[PDB]
C-alpha cells in the first residue's frame, strides 16, 4: 500500500509540475505568433 | 520523500533549460555580429 | 516500543543484528522459518542470530471476554483487511490514471518543444 | 520537465487551460488457509457470526439441560467475583502505570513529526535557492533576446 502511494505521490506532484511546463510553453509559442505576424505584415 | 524526489528531478532539468537558452543566445549573437558588418560596409562605399 | 511486522506492542521483543528493528518473538520466528531472511532489509538472518513489562488494565466489566470482546476483535480484523483490499485495488487504478496522464503530458512537451524553437528560429530568419 | 514553482508567481485559469491540453492527449492515447475464505465472506456480507448469549437467557424451574445452564451461571459468578477481587487488590495504581506508558509512547511520535518537518523544510530550502538562480539566468537570457530582436530591425 505505502510503496505505491509513494509512486502515486511522486507521479501526481510531477504531473502538475510537468503541467506547468505546458502553461509556460504555450504562452511563449503564442507570443512568437503575434510577433512574426505583425512583422511579416509590415 | 516528495521534495526529495522533487529536488532530484528538477536539478537535472534546470541545466537542460539553461543550455537550451544558452545555445539560443549564441545563435542570436551571430545575427547581431553579422548585421553590423553590412552597416560598417556603408562607409566603405562613401 | 512497537513490533515492525504486525503493529503490536510486544510482550517478548527481540532484535535482529543485521538490521536493528524490534520485532515480537513469535512473528519473527515465523518469518525465519518461512524464508530465512530479515523481512525489512532482505538480508541473511536466522533464529540464533536474534537477540532477546507492559501492563494492560482489564476492564471492570470483565462472559464478555467470551462473547462481546472476542466478537469485536474478529469483526475489526475482518472489516479492516477487506477495506484494506479495497484500498489496494483503488490505488492501482489510480496508478494507471497517473502514468497515462503523465505520458500524455510528455507528448505535449515533445510536441511543443518543436513548436517553440522553430517559431523563435523563424523570428531570427525574419530579420534577413 | 523544468517547471519553476517558487519563481513562477501561474493562475488557476492556466491550470484549467493546460489540463485541457493533457485531457485531449488522454483521449487520443485512451496466502492463507480457510480462515481467509470466512473472513472475506463475513466482511463482504457485513454480517457477524452470532455468539452464545444463552447464559443470560436462563430461567428457573426448567429441564436438565437448563440445570446445566444455571450451574454454569454459578461458575461464572465465582469467576467474576475472583476477577473483581484481583482488580480491587491492584487498585487504580495498575491503571496508573499503564497511563504513564502511554505518555512515553505518545512523545516518541511527536519527535518523529519534528524530524520529518525539519527535513522537508530543508529539501524546500535547497530548492528555493536553485529557483532564484534559475530566475536570473532566464531573465538575463530574455533581456539579451529582446536586445537582439530590436538591433536586427535597426540594422536592416
What 3-state DSSP class applies to C14?
A: strand
Contacts of B30 in chain D (CB under 8 A): none
Provide the sign of the torsion angle of the four alpha carbons A37, A38, A41, A42, taken in this order.
negative
* Distance from C-alpha of D82 to C-alpha of C59, rounded to nearest angstrom: 14
Q: In angstroms, how far is CA C125 from the centroid of its own chain?
A: 57
Residue D3 maps to a domain? no
Neighbours of chain A (3+ CB pairs under 8 A): B, C, D
CB B6 within 8 Å of CB D123: yes
CB C24 within 8 Å of CB C6: yes
Instruction: Give residues with Cβ within 8 angstroms of C85, minimum separation 6.
Output: none
Residue D29 maps to a domain? yes
Neighbours of chain B (3+ CB pairs under 8 A): A, C, D
- Any chain B CB within 8 A of the CB of A10? yes
Please answer yes or no on whether B1 and A13 come within 8 Å at the CB atom.
no
Residue D54 maps to a domain? yes
Q: How many residue pairs from chains A and D have C-beta atoms closer than 8 A?
A: 33
Of C117, C124, C128, the CB nearest to B28: C124
Please answer yes or no on whether C123 and A36 come within 8 Å at the CB atom.
yes
Instruction: Give residues with Cβ within 8 angstroms of D18, minimum separation 6.
Output: A19, A20, A22, A23, A26
* Distance from C-alpha of C17 to C-alpha of C47, rounded to nearest angstrom: 11
Which domain does D77 fall in, by range? Answer: 10-155
- Any chain D CB within 8 A of the CB of A17? yes
- Any chain A CB within 8 A of the CB of C91? yes
Of D3, D14, D22, the CB nearest to A17: D3
CA-based nearest residue in chain D for residue C123 = D149
The torsion angle over the Cα atoms of residues D56, D61, D62 and D64, rounded to 10 degrees, is 110
Please name the residue that has the C-alpha cell 548585421. B35
Q: What are the backbone angles phi and psi of residue C22, rounded to the nearest 5°?
A: -80, 125
Q: Is C51 left (phi over 0), alpha (psi -120 to 50) or beta?
A: beta
Residue D5 maps to a domain? no
What 3-state DSSP class applies to D92?
A: coil
CB D62 within 8 Å of CB C21: no
For helices A2-41 and D12-29, angle between their N-to-C axes, nearest 10 degrees:
100
Residue D26 maps to a domain? yes
Nearest C-alpha of chain A: how many angstroms from D101? 28
HEC profile of chain C = CCCCCCCCCCCCEEECCCCCCEEEHHHHHHHHHHCCECCCCCCECCCCCCECCCCCCCCCCCCCCCCHHHHHHHHHHHHHHHHHHHHHHHHHHHHHHHHHHHHHHHHHHHHHHHHHHHHHHHHHHHHC
Residue D24 maps to a domain? yes
Provide the sign of the torsion angle of the four alpha carbons D119, D124, D127, D132, taken in this order.
negative
Q: Which residues pair with C24 in a beta bridge?
A: C13
Q: Is D142 left (phi over 0), alpha (psi -120 to 50) or beta?
A: alpha
C-alpha cell of residue C122: 523563424
Residue D1 maps to a domain? no
- Any chain D CB within 8 A of the CB of A24? yes
Angle B18-D129-D4 from CA coordinates, rounded to 5°:
50
Residue D104 maps to a domain? yes
- When divided into structural domains, chain D yields a total of 1
CB C117 within 8 Å of CB A31: no
CB C27 within 8 Å of CB C16: no
* Distance from C-alpha of D43 to C-alpha of C75, rounded to nearest angstrom: 8
Type and span of the H or E element at D110: helix D93-155
Q: In angstroms, how far is CA C69 from the centroid of its own chain?
A: 28
Q: Quick one: which of A16, A37, C125 has its CA closest to B34?
A: C125
In angstroms, the first-to-last Cα distance of chain B is: 70
CA-based nearest residue in chain B for residue D156 = B35
* Distance from C-alpha of D137 to C-alpha of D148, rounded to nearest angstrom: 17
Nearest C-alpha of chain D: how many angstroms from B46? 18
Instruction: Give residues with Cβ within 8 angstroms of B12, minimum separation 6.
Output: D1
Resolution stated for this PDB structure, in Å: 3.6
Nearest C-alpha of chain A: how many angstroms from C10? 23
DSSP state of A24: H
Q: Quick one: which of D134, D115, D120, D137 has its CA closest to D6?
A: D134
Tell me whether residue C116 is exposed, middle or buried, using C-beta atoms within 10 angstroms of its C-beta: 0 to 12, 13 to 18, 19 or more.
Answer: middle
Please answer yes or no on whether A32 and C123 come within 8 Å at the CB atom.
yes
Q: How many residue pairs from chains B and C have C-beta atoms closer than 8 A?
A: 9
Amino acid at each position: 500500500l505505502d510503496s505505491l502511494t509513494k509512486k502515486l505521490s511522486t507521479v501526481m506532484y510531477e504531473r502538475d509540475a510537468a503541467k506547468l511546463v505546458a502553461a509556460q510553453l504555450l504562452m511563449e509559442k503564442n507570443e512568437d505568433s503575434k510577433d512574426l505576424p505583425k512583422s511579416s505584415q509590415q | 520523500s516528495t521534495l526529495c524526489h522533487h529536488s532530484l528531478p528538477a536539478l537535472i532539468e534546470g541545466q537542460r533549460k539553461y543550455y537550451a537558452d544558452y545555445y539560443a543566445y549564441r545563435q542570436e549573437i551571430r545575427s547581431l555580429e553579422g548585421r553590423r558588418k553590412r552597416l560598417q560596409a556603408m562607409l566603405n562605399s562613401s | 516500543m512497537l513490533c515492525a511486522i504486525s503493529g503490536k506492542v510486544p510482550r517478548r521483543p527481540v532484535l535482529s543484528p543485521k538490521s536493528r528493528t524490534i520485532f515480537e518473538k513469535s512473528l519473527l520466528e515465523q518469518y525465519v522459518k518461512d524464508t530465512g531472511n530479515d523481512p525489512i532489509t532482505n538480508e541473511p538472518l536466522s533464529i540464533e542470530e536474534i537477540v532477546e513489562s507492559a501492563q494492560q488494565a482489564s476492564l471492570t466489566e470483565s462472559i464478555p471476554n467470551l462473547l462481546t470482546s472476542l466478537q469485536n476483535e474478529w469483526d475489526a480484523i475482518m472489516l479492516e483487511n477487506f477495506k484494506l483490499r479495497s484500498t489496494l485495488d483503488s490505488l492501482t487504478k489510480k496508478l494507471s490514471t497517473v502514468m497515462y496522464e503523465r505520458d500524455a503530458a510528455k507528448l505535449v512537451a515533445a510536441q511543443l518543444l518543436m513548436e517553440k524553437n522553430e517559431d523563435s528560429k523563424d523570428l531570427p530568419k525574419s530579420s534577413q | 520537465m523544468d517547471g519553476l514553482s517558487f519563481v513562477d508567481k501561474i493562475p488557476d485559469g492556466y491550470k484549467n487551460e493546460i489540463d485541457q491540453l493533457v485531457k485531449k492527449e488522454f483521449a487520443n492515447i485512451k496466502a492463507d488457509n480457510s480462515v481467509s475464505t470466512l473472513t472475506n465472506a463475513l466482511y463482504t456480507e457485513y454480517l457477524k457470526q452470532r455468539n452464545n448469549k444463552k447464559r443470560r437467557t436462563p430461567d428457573f424451574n426448567d429441564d436438565d439441560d437448563t440445570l446445566f445452564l444455571e450451574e454454569y451461571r454459578r461458575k461464572y459468578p465465582r469467576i467474576d467475583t475472583s476477577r473483581y477481587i484481583p482488580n480491587e487488590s491492584s487498585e487504580v495504581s495498575l491503571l496508573g502505570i499503564v497511563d504513564s506508558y502511554l505518555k512515553h509512547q505518545e512523545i516518541v511520535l511527536d519527535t518523529l513529526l519534528p524530524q520529518t518537518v525539519s527535513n522537508q523544510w530543508r529539501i524546500n530550502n535547497d530548492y528555493i535557492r536553485q529557483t532564484c538562480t534559475i530566475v536570473e539566468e532566464m531573465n538575463i537570457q530574455q533581456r539579451k533576446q529582446i536586445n537582439d530582436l530590436e538591433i536586427y530591425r535597426k540594422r536592416l
